[PDB]
């Protein structure tokens, strides 16, 4: 993709004790016009891993299609063997690299979250194929804005509980609602555990404007 038409915005994900929470909003802005204000930007992959992305929404639909077909195929193998989330991460990295090697990149910014076999997993995939693991990921302007809250609390406390993690995600999305121009007060939280994968509904934020009464 040379020119991204319909972009999303920042995606937040962080591990906790035996699970990964991912939250991204539901906005499909074109240029500055928030044209598609009710879209889904997280795919709930089969039972362990879970995907969220940024960049071109059409490319996300495309990779949604391809990953869905591959997951359906392994589940129809009937062998009792699944994809680890790290295997999905490797495949996606190779896919993005082979996209940009042919000078036709997929304009995305993807976050892979998974919990399989006791261990959580949270992987990152860039457009250029830059890919790594991290205890807390933040895309787009989130790496500029909501990343230091994650890096503050994880330095202050390396492990978490589910409630503290979810609350921290809520606070970061509030902050992104405050000062991202491409943002919207409607977001959805998605969560993986060993109990399965769960997508919560379109939550919102609670804002403050008491600094506006000053001059």
């Amino acid at each position: 993709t040379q020119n991204p038409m319909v972009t999303g915005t920042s995606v937040l994900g962080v591990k906790f004790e035996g699970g990964v929470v991912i939250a991204a909003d539901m906005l499909g802005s074109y240029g500055s016009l928030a044209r598609f204000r009710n879209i889904s930007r997280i795919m709930r992959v089969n039972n362990s891993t879970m995907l969220g992305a940024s960049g071109d929404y059409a490319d996300f639909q495309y990779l949604k299609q391809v990953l869905g077909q591959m997951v359906i195929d392994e589940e129809l193998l009937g062998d009792g063997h699944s994809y680890s989330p790290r295997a999905i991460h490797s495949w996606l990295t190779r896919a993005m690299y082979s996209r940009r090697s042919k000078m036709n990149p997929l304009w995305n910014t993807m976050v892979i979250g998974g919990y399989a076999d006791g261990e959580s997993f949270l992987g990152y995939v860039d457009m250029l194929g830059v890919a790594y693991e991290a205890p807390s990921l933040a895309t787009g302007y989130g790496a500029y804005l909501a990343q230091p809250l994650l890096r503050e609390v994880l330095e202050k406390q390396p492990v978490l509980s589910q409630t503290e993690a979810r609350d921290l995600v809520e606070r970061c999305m509030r902050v992104l609602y405050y000062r991202d121009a491409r943002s919207y007060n409607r977001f959805q939280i998605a969560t993986v555990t060993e109990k399965g994968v769960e997508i919560e509904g379109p939550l919102s934020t609670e804002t403050n404007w008491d600094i506006a009464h000053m001059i």
Binding site: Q2, P4, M5, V6, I39, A58, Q61
Partner: protein, 191 residues
């Protein structure tokens, strides 16, 4: 230019201006901007003209062939998928503002939108065209959940009226389309 599709309980309602322009000169004063594909499914276009015409012809080809081979009436989401595949695989050279609507026996009336990129979404109402921003300004003001047919006709009539009145590219004459289970009822308003 400015195209619009609104669904209701029974079916969907379409609408467009005409005014095919080239630069600042009007080449054509009256245009079938909306195009039949199947007997129950329409699409209305924007952007470049030749691109959307050739794509719509190929979609008519593939969709007619598939729906004859099924020996069943086609889905609407299927035609949306066809426009999605042809738009996304060969973007880069096209400028398509394709909006798919149409009644279905299984799923009722549906409205899909395919903008210049190639994403596909189902909507309850849609805008499209360069002069669509303004009535996109108030279509989230005037909309009420659960309209009738006449409320949709009056609604889109006021919409395309103000869009044709304000935008320089929009104008011409008003074409409407009402698609339901019963039949296809098209009409042309003027003045």
């Amino acid at each position: 230019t400015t195209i619009m599709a609104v669904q209701f309980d029974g079916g969907v309602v379409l609408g467009a201006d005409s005014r095919t322009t080239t630069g600042s000169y009007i080449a054509n004063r009256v245009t079938d901007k909306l195009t039949p594909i199947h007997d129950r499914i329409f699409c209305c276009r924007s952007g470049s003209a030749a691109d959307t015409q050739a794509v719509a012809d190929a979609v008519t080809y593939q969709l007619g062939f598939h729906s004859i081979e099924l020996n069943e009436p086609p889905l609407v989401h299927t035609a949306a998928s066809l426009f999605k595949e042809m738009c996304y695989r060969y973007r880069e050279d096209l400028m398509a503002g394709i909006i798919i609507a149409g009644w279905d026996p299984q799923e009722g009336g549906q409205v899909y939108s395919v903008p210049m990129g190639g994403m596909m979404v189902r909507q309850s109402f849609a805008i499209g065209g360069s002069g669509s921003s303004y009535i996109y300004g108030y279509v989230d003001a005037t909309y009420r959940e659960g309209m009738t047919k006449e409320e949709c006709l009056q609604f889109t009539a006021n919409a395309l009226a103000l869009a044709m009145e304000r935008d320089g590219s929009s104008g011409g004459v008003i074409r409407l389309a009402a698609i339901a289970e019963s039949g296809v009822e098209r009409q042309v308003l003027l003045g």
